[PDB]
Amino acid sequence: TPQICVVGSGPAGFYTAQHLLKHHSRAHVDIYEKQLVPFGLVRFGVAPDHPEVKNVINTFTQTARSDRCAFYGNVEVGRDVTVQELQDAYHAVVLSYGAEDHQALDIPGEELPGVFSARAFVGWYNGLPENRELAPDLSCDTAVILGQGNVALDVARILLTPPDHLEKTDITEAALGALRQSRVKTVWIVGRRGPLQVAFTIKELREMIQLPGTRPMLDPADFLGLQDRIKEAARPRKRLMELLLRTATEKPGVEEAARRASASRAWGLRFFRSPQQVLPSPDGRRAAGIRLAVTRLEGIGEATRAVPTGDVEDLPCGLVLSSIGYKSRPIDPSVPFDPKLGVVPNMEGRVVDVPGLYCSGWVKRGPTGVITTTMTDSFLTGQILLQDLKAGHLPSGPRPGSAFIKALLDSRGVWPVSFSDWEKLDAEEVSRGQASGKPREKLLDPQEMLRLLGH
Ligand SMILES: Cc1cc2nc3c(=O)[nH]c(=O)nc-3n(C[C@H](O)[C@H](O)[C@H](O)COP(=O)(O)OP(=O)(O)OC[C@H]3O[C@@H](n4cnc5c(N)ncnc54)[C@H](O)[C@@H]3O)c2cc1C
Ligand SMILES: NC(=O)c1ccc[n+]([C@@H]2O[C@H](COP(=O)([O-])OP(=O)(O)OC[C@H]3O[C@@H](n4cnc5c(N)ncnc54)[C@H](OP(=O)(O)O)[C@@H]3O)[C@@H](O)[C@H]2O)c1
């Protein structure tokens, strides 16, 4: 009986466990997670107004209910148990811990109150325990978001959606409250390159264009030479550039021009600007604006880069959301790590120079890609592992698995959360939502969570 374990319970951990159980009839798989509950970014990242994306949880639940799979919540690898200890107890270990940081802006004024990263803002409305006291100040009337990817569109969208539409979703009661009292009425999404280089996709661009109660603000002159610099383009991108182009140079209708007429809120895209400094309010207590540098594009195809002209533009606002990407961090200094790419160095999932040690997901390929991309790349890691198994390259001797790790957890006084234990937490979340008609009301205090379980 082979013993294997995974580090992290988001999509890379679970899709890696499903492949192993299906193609090896006796292997046992244990999954370790630092949060008390499973699923990663499917629960704490995907927006609450996107319930259909979260349906992969059903396939995860089936994997976890199998008799050769076990879950161990509330365990922080590299702190409560080290990577070397798991390497000694199992025949193989799979690092799937994602990317827990945000890329920093690194400019004068970033520390001023009213400045936040998108990732801290998303964790706030999604119920991630460490951000439950974020208390963003929504009493200003303008918000500026830096960077143009799908993450930037999701915070602009929760900021501008009429609060009643968010009513029946799983958003936090506390975040819902605060959005009801917000004065934010204008949102700007600022990029350093031009339209041709945006990072978001079409389903997401189109929901923004149609968001009830709002209107779009695109400038006609940023869009010159578009419809020509896109002759040779492939279906995907060209379609996207024509939705942006339509929306920015074509006359609405009698109805659509009137929807735009009575809308209390507005959102716009800005091009050729780069974050230079956050401006302080007269007495310094908060943020009052952002000073952007003017830029010009030099280079060809993908590979184009933005260069500065020497000019500047000051933009007033009371809320700055930094959305220029996430980033992985080293977990345990015994583990290799490349600080330039933000990944664990590897060759098709094999950690460089570390027999028995593998990787899956964002920590294996970088912090980009959707759930389906994470899924199939995880299937690849699992194939390489099972072939290394069958050919005899893993420890050819009996290994204890959880019998040994559980003895250490006990001694250090760490209480692991099992899947049946999650089934209970899950049920309490469901009944707590029953009165307000939400699918659930998320539990946010770890201490209370442990209490509801009997400790
Ligand atoms: C805001 C946002 C919205 C997104 N929306 C979509 C969408 O709508 N559609 C889509 O298809 N994709 C979306 N994605 C992308 C999707 O989230 C990723 O493709 C996917 O979750 C990456 O999976 P992962 O397993 O690598 O990592 P993650 O999901 O991050 O999971 C890593 C897991 O490891 C745990 N962990 C971390 N450190 C440790 C440690 N030391 N010990 C133990 N456990 C640890 C984390 O707590 C977590 O549970 C979104 C991403 C973000 C950020
Ligand atoms: N529905 C979905 O499928 C979905 C939904 C949400 C999230 N996700 C995914 O999850 C992943 C993470 O996304 P993400 O939005 O945070 O990142 P992303 O997609 O890579 O976009 C990052 C942005 O920040 C910019 N940038 C980088 N450094 C900058 C700097 N120092 N100053 C200014 N701008 C800077 C980039 O501009 P530049 O282009 O010039 O460099 C780019 O606009 C993506 O793969 C996203 O697609 C998917």
Curated annotation (Swiss-Prot):
The gene is FDXR. This is NADPH:adrenodoxin oxidoreductase, mitochondrial. The lineage of its organism: Eukaryota, Metazoa, Chordata, Craniata, Vertebrata. Its EC number is 1.18.1.6. InterPro entries: FAD/NAD-bd_sf (IPR036188), FAD/NAD-binding_dom (IPR023753), Ferredox_Rdtase (IPR055275), Ferredox_Rdtase_adrenod (IPR021163). GO terms for molecular function: ferredoxin-NADP+ reductase activity; flavin adenine dinucleotide binding; NADP binding. One of its GO terms (cellular component) is mitochondrial inner membrane. FAD binds at residues 12, 33, 41, 77, 362, 369-371. The modification Phosphoserine is found at residues 274, 281. Also acts as a ferredoxin--NADP(+) reductase essential for coenzyme Q biosynthesis: together with FDX2, transfers the electrons required for the hydroxylation reaction performed by COQ6. It catalyses: 2 reduced [adrenodoxin] + NADP(+) + H(+) = 2 oxidized [adrenodoxin] + NADPH; 2 reduced [2Fe-2S]-[ferredoxin] + NADP(+) + H(+) = 2 oxidized [2Fe-2S]-[ferredoxin] + NADPH. It holds the Pfam family Pyr_redox_2. Keywords: Cholesterol metabolism, Electron transport, FAD, Flavoprotein, Lipid metabolism, Membrane, Mitochondrion, Mitochondrion inner membrane, NADP, Oxidoreductase, Phosphoprotein, Steroid metabolism, Sterol metabolism, Transit peptide, Transport. GO terms for biological process: cholesterol metabolic process; electron transport chain; steroid biosynthetic process; ubiquinone biosynthetic process. PANTHER family: GLUTAMATE SYNTHASE 1 [NADH], CHLOROPLASTIC-LIKE. Detected in adrenal cortex and corpus luteum (at protein level).
